[PDB]
Amino acid sequence: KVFGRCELAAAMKRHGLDNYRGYSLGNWVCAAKFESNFNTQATNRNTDGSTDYGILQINSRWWCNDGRTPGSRNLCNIPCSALLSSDITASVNCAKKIVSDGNGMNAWVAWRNRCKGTDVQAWIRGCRL
Ligand SMILES: [Cl-]
Ligand SMILES: [Cl-]
Ligand SMILES: [Cl-]
Ligand SMILES: [Cl-]
Ligand SMILES: [Cl-]
Ligand SMILES: [Cl-]
Ligand SMILES: [Cl-]
Ligand SMILES: [Cl-]
Ligand code: NA
């Protein structure tokens, strides 16, 4: 599923991501934009052989199991495929665990490079939330 900007904002808010670990909703929408362009089915292979999955491009090296990332962990205890669903629940619950692990949203490289320090509020501007 390819989300609209305000549509994703609303789904994110409903699943408790808004100001989770102090990160306003705009941060999460901006990260989703540049990680997946709002596409729940986005996948991308990393050089090390791991793969990033879903609207927030969660990586198989640590967070989910895809059966082909030798020596990886599955800290969110989910198949990586579950992160590709039109329902964002699994991606949200995993993101909550990721953003809590010490480095905040810097875990998402696109967020650090393209969202951090910017007017993230622009991403939820105009949305009926
Ligand atoms: Cl947009
Ligand atoms: Cl915001
Ligand atoms: Cl394969
Ligand atoms: Cl594996
Ligand atoms: Cl594990
Ligand atoms: Cl699995
Ligand atoms: Cl949803
Ligand atoms: Cl933080
Ligand atoms: Na894994």
Swiss-Prot record:
Residues in C-type lysozyme domain copies: 1-129
Keyword terms of this UniProt record: Allergen, Antimicrobial, Bacteriolytic enzyme, Disulfide bond, Glycosidase, Hydrolase, Secreted, Signal
Catalytic activity of the protein: Hydrolysis of (1->4)-beta-linkages between N-acetylmuramic acid and N-acetyl-D-glucosamine residues in a peptidoglycan and between N-acetyl-D-glucosamine residues in chitodextrins
GO BP: any one term: defense response to Gram-positive bacterium
Record CDD domains: LYZ_C
Cellular-component GO terms for this entry: cytoplasm; endoplasmic reticulum; extracellular space
Tissue expression as described in the entry: In the egg white and polymorphonuclear leukocytes.
Enzyme class: hydrolase
Catalytic center residues: E35, D52
SS bond list: C6-C127, C30-C115, C64-C80, C76-C94
Keyword Signal included in the entry's annotation: yes
Its EC number(s): 3.2.1.17
Pfam families: Lys
GO MF, one annotated term: identical protein binding
Binding of substrate, residues: D101
Family classification: Belongs to the glycosyl hydrolase 22 family.
Miscellaneous notes: Lysozyme C is capable of both hydrolysis and transglycosylation; it also shows a slight esterase activity. It acts rapidly on both peptide-substituted and unsubstituted peptidoglycan, and slowly on chitin oligosaccharides.
Protein's name according to its UniProt entry: Lysozyme C
Organism for this UniProt entry: Gallus gallus
Lineage: Eukaryota, Metazoa, Chordata, Craniata, Vertebrata
